Amino acid sequence: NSVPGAPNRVSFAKLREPLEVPGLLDVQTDSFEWLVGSDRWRQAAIDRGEENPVGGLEEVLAELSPIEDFSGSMSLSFSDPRFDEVKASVDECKDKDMTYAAPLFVTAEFINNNTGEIKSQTVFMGDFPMMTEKGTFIINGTERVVVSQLVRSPGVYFDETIDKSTEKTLHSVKVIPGRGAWLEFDVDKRDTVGVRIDRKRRQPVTVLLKALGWTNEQIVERFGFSEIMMGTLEKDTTSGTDEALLDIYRKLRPGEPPTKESAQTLLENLFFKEKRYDLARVGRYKVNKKLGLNAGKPITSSTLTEEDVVATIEYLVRLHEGQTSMTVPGGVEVPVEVDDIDHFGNRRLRTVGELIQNQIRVGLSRMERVVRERMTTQDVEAITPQTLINIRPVVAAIKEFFGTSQLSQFMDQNNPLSGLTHKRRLSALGPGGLSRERAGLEVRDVHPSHYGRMCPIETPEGPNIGLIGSLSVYARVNPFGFIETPYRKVENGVVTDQIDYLTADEEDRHVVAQANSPTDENGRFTEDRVMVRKKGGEVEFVSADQVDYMDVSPRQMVSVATAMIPFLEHDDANRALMGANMQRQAVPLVRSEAPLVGTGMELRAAIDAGDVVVADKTGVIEEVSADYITVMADDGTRQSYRLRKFARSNHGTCANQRPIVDAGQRVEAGQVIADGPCTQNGEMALGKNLLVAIMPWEGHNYEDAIILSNRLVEEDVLTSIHIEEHEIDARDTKLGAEEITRDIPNVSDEVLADLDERGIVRIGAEVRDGDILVGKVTPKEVRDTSLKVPHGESGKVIGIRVFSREDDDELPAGVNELVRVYVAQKRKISDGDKLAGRHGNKGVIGKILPVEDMPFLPDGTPVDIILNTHGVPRRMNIGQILETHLGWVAKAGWNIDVAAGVPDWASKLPEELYSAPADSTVATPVFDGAQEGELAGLLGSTLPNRDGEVMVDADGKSTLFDGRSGEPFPYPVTVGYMYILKLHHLVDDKIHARSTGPYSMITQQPLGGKAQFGGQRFGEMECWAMQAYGAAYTLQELLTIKSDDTVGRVKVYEAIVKGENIPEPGIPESFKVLLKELQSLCLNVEVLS
Amino acid sequence: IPRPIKSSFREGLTVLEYFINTHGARKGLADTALRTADSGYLTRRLVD
Amino acid sequence: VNFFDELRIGLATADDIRNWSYGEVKKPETINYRTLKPEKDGLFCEKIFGPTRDWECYCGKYKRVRFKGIICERCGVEVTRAKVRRERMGHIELA
Amino acid sequence: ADEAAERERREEEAYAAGVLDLMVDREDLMDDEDHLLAQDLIDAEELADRFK
Amino acid sequence: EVIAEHPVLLNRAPTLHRLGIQAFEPQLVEGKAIQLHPLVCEAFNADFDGDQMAVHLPLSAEAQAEARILMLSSNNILSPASGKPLAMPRLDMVTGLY
Amino acid sequence: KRLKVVAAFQSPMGMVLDAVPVIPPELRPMVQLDGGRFATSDLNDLYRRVINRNNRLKRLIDLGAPEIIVNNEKRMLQESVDALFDNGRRGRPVTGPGNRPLKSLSDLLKGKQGRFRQNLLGKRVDYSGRSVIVVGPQLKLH
Amino acid sequence: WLSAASFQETTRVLTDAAINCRSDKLNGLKENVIIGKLIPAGTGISRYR
Ligand SMILES: [Mg+2]
Ligand SMILES: [Zn+2]
């Protein structure tokens, strides 16, 4: 029906969804296809609204074009962009650090006014990076992402501000174009109304009025009814504006020859022309939607404006007293409100397309200056397009952006969900936004307009709690960047199948209902009073016809990772936040097992993430294998798919793809063919289902720790593969040149026994700290400097990749060769490692118990994991309990006794749930899932085991035994199947030690970091906590002969290894520095005694 | 807010009884750090 | 050492500076791009500020660690360790 | 007399900056997961304003 | 034979009182984690939801003695603010005794 | 004021100098990088500038010239020495080569990090380690 | 002065300390750590050391 290869995953849902989950990463692709005027977006735009659908590049090349010098004689102009075919595929770019891009062309034309000539040729503007089917730009071998960015929308924004001395509310103004005249009107502390242009000294506001060529009569005509007028009208200023304009000017650029024409041109150029005034269509539209200007009229070219500047002062005055509505003499009627900074009708989204557009704009401005110079300096008849173009600035800008900009981020490539959330991530920090000022509680909080646009739960936990969210599922983006969420229209009390993608400026004006508002049939409601939202997020119990719109589903405000947590609504926002943020840092496992009790949003999350290899045209599998697949479509063609086996991600994890098909199997476009790292048949599997008991054991699950069974180490259940990439570079130096050889100065052969006749380890080797991965030699006759495995690493090699300059590879400049070895480790679960379910129930293993000593059901089933009771209630993560019970049911299926009649609790249950087999997946969506009454009578059925017995009660509990004492347990105990995850918080990456290693060379302190064999930091709080005891020799140690004292450390090491008693410190290096730094100021610190 | 949450974590929260429970959560997860900061301030002073 | 009892601070009569120092400074040449070696009798110098690398001269006469404490009559630096470049200041003497 | 107030406010700013530099940082934490911290919610200058 | 009776200090950031630092006698456990008595988890505000710990070795004999005597875990039972014990049964021990 | 200050001296040959101390180089980071690009800071061109001005004076007294310009160059030398000791006491201070001012000896002990507000920020010690923790219930307090 | 020079407007402190030839005697422990010396507390003070 909806998806072909959909393993039967029963649904406890009761409502009917009139909208399928849109393309979960369609925002990135749509924005790009808008940045390159692609044809699909062309048809999209034409089919809806405008019929001249300009792209995003053409807008740049046009707003700039034409171009000419000051003398105007000769001009130039671009047109007709166009794209070539990519030079290399994706994996073909990865395997050699190449880049994914396409040659970009242009069609420029030069002309001369005296000759009236035309030379129009196509130019080449480099290699334009490009987006894949996933949403990731590739940059020099790596897979990258370009996240969105929340910013303010250009347009008037008003805000009352109370003087902290005299508590008198006075309003204000600010016209905030994309660039140009930065400005703010206001009601001054006096009745007068001053301005502040260019963010500078204030002046009257009638001044600027009569500056445009106006008079006091028309002013008092169109507005003379507010006192603030007289205050600023009684200035006794020369009505002929000849100086105050020149005064403003002389304030701008002190030292100018004075002229009325000068100030005239400055005012008409800095506020009313593209030079330094351009309300990008978003801003002109924000100022049109408000004040009701030019209603129902195109918006192409009204950035500059002589009327959008005059109605703003009217808004401000009429808001002073509170005139609750307005109307332009020719426009529409709009209210008089104030403007919030977070309201999404005032914020907007700088999608990737717009960032790239802007960097291209900058590069083209640099090229513009270049050609201005070449054109007012070079002689005519020798300059035509290929000579009037220096592209390097453009390419350099694009690469600078894609390399440095904090928005050009590596792909969070732990698991498909991590990557899929790194896309759709809304980042309110970056070039153009806030970084220092608003890092408080006015942007790090939730707003009622975040309903269907951002998930109030999913947000990183580090420094960016609130500055980084995650776009929701049923959401899209206006061409203008304003986010949109769908809503079902409703009229007279009968719901409809119509759907409108509204934005907050079109929703606060209306009344929206809720999803669960029941409806009998045909579209009619069931009650007379329902629940609704309103303008200021004020929920209400209100009538059934007053409504005007209606939601489209539950889970409309939640993100993806939050729409995968079952029984979420039974949790607390903080623990759901933890769970969301702890599914992203889950490591792929060897065998991915689908979730027994899950949520419907588990298939799309892998179809729409680019880690499953799907078909493209209904057909027949023809040839199968581990690496390659060969389809034979029913159209005549033969599609061939290639699987990436054992590919290191950007975090260390594997990417093993395996096929789920056989030979001859019919398929259907969209039907999965091969799973990914964390998928089973097409649905996201991040961890495993485990038999759970909930009970305090003999002191090993104390304080959030937990227990496991050695079975999870025999059967390789929670086993995970980790891959590491070491490398070196062979280059030149002063003493000659670097080489990569097996010849090693003065060593034994046990070392080299694993290497080959070239210097690199033989694939299939077994290495460890102290093993030569590649033999390099550095001159001076030579130096012993090869590559060696660090402390704590070990495993078997997989790949050796040697890129050589002698064989035409785009290596760096000071380089002759580049060698990259890949090693791998099959790490098992172990003490210290971290685990967590989906409801923030995290914990580090503290024991691993022999199966023979684990509490076992009478059937012998030895429980695997043992949680604790004292962690559920005081945290409000009760959902897991339910996830537990249902799990058991889903494992040992049920058959409701309908022989008599469907019990009252199974009334709302839909058919296909009255019966099920054993080990049967399920789906309990978030806010339309299995309530607590359809579950406290489901456990009853709970089909028995093979021996006919039920190993569970009607409450979810069993009568466990003990493996050590043998005796049973007195009271019944909870038991079930809970889905846990493995995290990247492994001890093998966290343990760190040091006795004597490398130092700073600048402060003479042990270095900091396991990455570089560093030491631990003995801060100030620790100094205090020591002084409090009375320990003065230990502190002397930790400050002198362990950090700074340069001879003490070595004398101490040596005395120790000799058995002697260690000496006392000398003088630290910090004090020495202090003394020989004071002496620099001609202060004589003379010690005494 | 005069619109309370008449539903528990067992009976199951609704949506809008769940979109107003976040505000304070984020507020607190941000306030914790400022609390630690003011504590460190008082402590460094009392030690001075 | 670290038997201290008091730290008397105060001004330094300009002769005290001359006493602190092992030499003066007369060349306003921090470094020369070439030779990867700071200039002579200048800033970041090698005459007052210790032997740069290890018991080393700039001439290249006595790099022999065997000997110790010999200044070079061609370049003027004493072969010592502990990067004495750190505990060595110089007196500028103007008029 | 706008001479003292300058040194007063600057010394208070410096005291609060030292207070912040005194707390542990993310390169030195021993917690579950990187959480929010004093150094990225408020500035020394506001930590001074709010004690006067 | 080179680890017997030689104590080591354990710190957990942040450090908010003299009992945030304590000296223990180390035994050897095949693993990669640092065990810890479950009574001192209050002094440290330490829970095992992925937290960390830092070790420090004393070398001199004065320091070994300061550890053994001033900063040991058994000689440090009471909080120096109220005199009320700080290493006592808290969560599951309490329920068992109850 | 007079009494406190003078009685402080109850010798005052410190308020003026005919000599000056120059720190050692290791405390002034100026190294090289692969390719021919330096790694330099804003505390070492000041001694060079001061030597330049003392040189401009070294050929303006014995060589023979009028007291006017000798004394003006002396004032300039003093204004340049004021950069070695906390340039920032005249409003617009000495500006570095690119755009920003210089870091002077009085900054080492005065401002953001310094050496007095930094010698207590702690250390980074040897003979140490770090790891995650678990629960030993089979363990005695010691 | 070793201690108050760990506080602000230092230059004033150092100046006023130089003229008087102030000679800090190391009685506290906010400064005996700067010097890498034994704080006067616990296994510090003569009475025990
Ligand atoms: Mg914790
Ligand atoms: Zn020599």
Side-chain angles (χ1 to χ4, degrees), chain A residues 403-558:
Chain A
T404 76
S405 196
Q406 178 144 4
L407 314 186
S408 196
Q409 312 167 299
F410 283 72
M411 199 185 179
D412 205 358
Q413 189 175 359
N414 287 313
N415 41 3
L417 203 63
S418 180
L420 165 66
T421 55
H422 205 149
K423 323 167 210 177
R424 312 152 51 75
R425 190 174 290 297
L426 309 201
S427 182
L429 61 85
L434 66 92
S435 301
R436 60 100 179 167
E437 191 184 321
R438 278 85 71 186
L441 282 68
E442 297 83 335
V443 64
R444 284 187 201 255
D445 63 16
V446 175
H447 208 269
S449 47
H450 289 207
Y451 188 109
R453 301 143 164 92
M454 288 171 62
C455 182
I457 297 164
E458 197 166 28
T459 180
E461 49 265 62
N464 290 324
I465 280 166
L467 315 162
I468 290 188
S470 178
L471 170 66
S472 160
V473 294
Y474 311 140
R476 91 176 168 192
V477 182
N478 285 109
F480 289 8
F482 299 113
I483 300 180
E484 292 185 336
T485 178
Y487 287 134
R488 276 189 284 181
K489 189 183 280 173
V490 64
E491 52 87 17
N492 194 12
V494 60
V495 186
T496 314
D497 279 327
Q498 179 58 11
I499 291 185
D500 300 335
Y501 276 78
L502 303 189
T503 177
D505 285 329
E506 309 175 356
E507 172 193 323
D508 303 335
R509 170 170 285 178
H510 287 184
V511 181
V512 158
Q514 190 186 354
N516 287 86
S517 69
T519 69
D520 54 356
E521 184 164 357
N522 309 311
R524 185 77 184 198
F525 272 65
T526 286
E527 293 82 5
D528 290 332
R529 189 190 65 163
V530 307
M531 182 189 279
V532 308
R533 328 201 304 283
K534 268 283 208 180
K535 186 191 297 296
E538 69 210 345
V539 192
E540 315 180 315
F541 284 107
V542 304
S543 175
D545 196 320
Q546 188 192 31
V547 173
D548 299 328
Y549 266 115
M550 172 184 172
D551 281 337
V552 79
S553 193
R555 70 186 68 81
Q556 196 177 26
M557 57 162 191
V558 307

Side-chain angles (χ1 to χ4, degrees), chain D residues 32, chain E residues 12 47 49 51:
Chain D
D32 308 333
Chain E
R12 184 187 179 280
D47 58 6
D49 53 23
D51 287 345

Side-chain angles (χ1 to χ4, degrees), chain A residues 783-851:
Chain A
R783 205 166 69 201
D784 53 338
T785 57
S786 296
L787 180 64
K788 294 184 289 300
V789 160
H791 183 64
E793 314 207 334
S794 293
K796 272 177 247 170
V797 185
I798 309 173
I800 60 182
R801 290 295 311 180
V802 60
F803 310 157
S804 50
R805 197 201 284 290
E806 175 74 333
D807 273 7
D808 284 317
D809 279 276
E810 281 166 50
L811 285 170
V815 164
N816 295 277
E817 300 288 310
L818 182 67
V819 179
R820 269 171 201 160
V821 173
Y822 300 101
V823 300
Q825 201 183 6
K826 191 190 260 187
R827 272 184 214 168
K828 281 155 191 292
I829 199 78
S830 281
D831 307 73
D833 281 12
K834 211 194 179 177
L835 271 71
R838 296 185 273 180
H839 321 89
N841 47 56
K842 50 183 181 151
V844 306
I845 298 151
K847 204 71 192 315
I848 287 170
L849 280 173
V851 57

Side-chain angles (χ1 to χ4, degrees), chain A residues 338-365:
Chain A
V338 191
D339 302 67
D340 194 350
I341 306 158
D342 305 358
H343 198 288
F344 280 37
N346 297 317
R347 286 182 110 171
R348 80 180 294 274
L349 207 77
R350 273 178 183 180
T351 42
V352 56
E354 197 181 320
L355 318 183
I356 285 148
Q357 193 155 326
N358 301 344
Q359 298 300 135
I360 279 159
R361 175 180 293 155
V362 174
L364 294 176
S365 185

